[PDB]
């Protein structure tokens, strides 16, 4: 197994996957690492299995159909992965915890959103459709764009949203286009 966390790339107290060489801090993994379960498989391994059990799952999909899907166990899982994929980028540090808004010439968002809040929402089963998860994800970056305006710090929202969107297309097998 790896000696660093797959998500944050730091050593420390790590739980090793029994079916692949990745390791995780307790709270870096989504969902949080399960107390017992021997062997244990990580979310990378659980997502792999879904594709292997239904290879047709990787044919192209329309985003509109993906969003309207109900949050049954397999969609819940894919959203937990996608979220995890964003935390693997170090730049997610800027979007992780609750932000606050006091900049000259800007006004803060009507509806503030952050990754730890999305994380909590997923864990408490507050989304009924994929749409709800993806709306809040995108809200994160959209609030950052509007707030930071022409300050170059706005690029952090573009950068991190690109990670989100690429990984959304991958994980949910969105039909490729130009
Ligand atoms: Zn970690
Ligand atoms: Zn694994
Ligand atoms: Zn089949």
Residues of the domain holding 31: 1-59
Distance CA 122, CA 72 (A): 12
The encoded tokens of residue 134 equal 């993806």
**Same-domain status, 40 and 78:** no
Distance CA 175, CA 4 (A): 34
- Domains identified in the chain, total number: 2
Q: Which ligand is nearest to the CA of 56?
A: 3
Distances (CA, A) of 69 to 76, 117, 119, 131: 10, 21, 19, 8
Strand boundaries in the chain, DSSP class E: 15-16, 23-24
SS3 call for 129: strand
Domain boundary among 59, 76, 93: 59
**Same-domain status, 29 and 14:** yes
Tokens 């010439």, residue? 105
Determined by X-ray
Distance CA 132, CA 85 (A): 18
In 3D space, the residue among 156, 122, 138 whose CA is nearest the CA of residue 30 turns out to be 122
The Å distance, Cα 16 to ligand 2 centre, comes to 8
The Å distance, Cα 65 to ligand 2 centre, comes to 29
The Å distance, Cα 54 to ligand 3 centre, comes to 5
Distance CA 42, CA 138 (A): 26
Domain boundary among 59, 92, 108: 59
**Same-domain status, 100 and 149:** yes
**Same-domain status, 48 and 75:** no
Q: Which ligand is nearest to the CA of 29?
A: 1
SS3 call for 5: coil
Distances (CA, A) of 66 to 14, 57, 70, 130: 34, 12, 9, 7
Read off the CATH number of the domain in which 18 is found.
3.30.40.10
Domain boundary among 40, 59, 78: 59
Burial 78-110 (b: 16+ CB within 10 A, else e): bbbbbbbbbbebeebebbeeebeeeeeeeeebe
The Å distance, Cα 22 to ligand 1 centre, comes to 11
**Same-domain status, 78 and 132:** yes
**Same-domain status, 66 and 38:** no
**Same-domain status, 164 and 111:** yes
The Å distance, Cα 173 to ligand 1 centre, comes to 27
**Same-domain status, 121 and 137:** yes
Neighbours of ion ligand 2 (CB under 5 A): 17, 20, 42, 44-45
The Å distance, Cα 30 to ligand 3 centre, comes to 27
Read off the CATH number of the domain in which 173 is found.
1.20.920.10
Q: Which ligand is nearest to the CA of 8?
A: 1
**Same-domain status, 68 and 148:** yes
Instruction: Count CB-CB contacts under 10 A for residue 172.
Output: 21
The Å distance, Cα 15 to ligand 1 centre, comes to 10
**Same-domain status, 64 and 111:** yes
End-to-end, the C-alpha distance of the chain in Å comes to: 39
């Amino acid at each position: 197994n790896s000696n660093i966390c797959e998500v944050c790339n730091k050593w420390g107290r790590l739980f090793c996957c029994d079916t692949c060489p990745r390791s995780f801090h307790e709270h870096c993994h989504i969902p949080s690492v399960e107390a017992n379960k021997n062997p244990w498989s990580c979310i990378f391994c659980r997502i792999k299995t879904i594709q292997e059990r239904c290879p047709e799952s990787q044919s192209g999909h329309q985003e509109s159909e993906v969003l309207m899907r109900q949050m049954l166990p397999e969609e819940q899982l894919k959203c937990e992965f996608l979220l995890l994929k964003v935390y693997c980028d170090s730049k997610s540090c800027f979007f992780a915890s609750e932000p606050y808004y006091n900049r000259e010439g800007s006004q803060g968002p009507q509806k503030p959103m952050w990754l730890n809040k999305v994380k909590t929402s997923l864990n408490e089963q507050m989304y009924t459709r994929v749409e709800g998860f993806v709306q809040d994800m995108r809200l994160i970056f959209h609030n950052h764009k509007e707030f930071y305006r022409e300050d170059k710090f706005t690029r952090l929202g573009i950068q991190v949203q690109d990670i989100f969107e690429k990984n959304f297309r991958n994980i949910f097998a969105i039909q490729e286009t130009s």
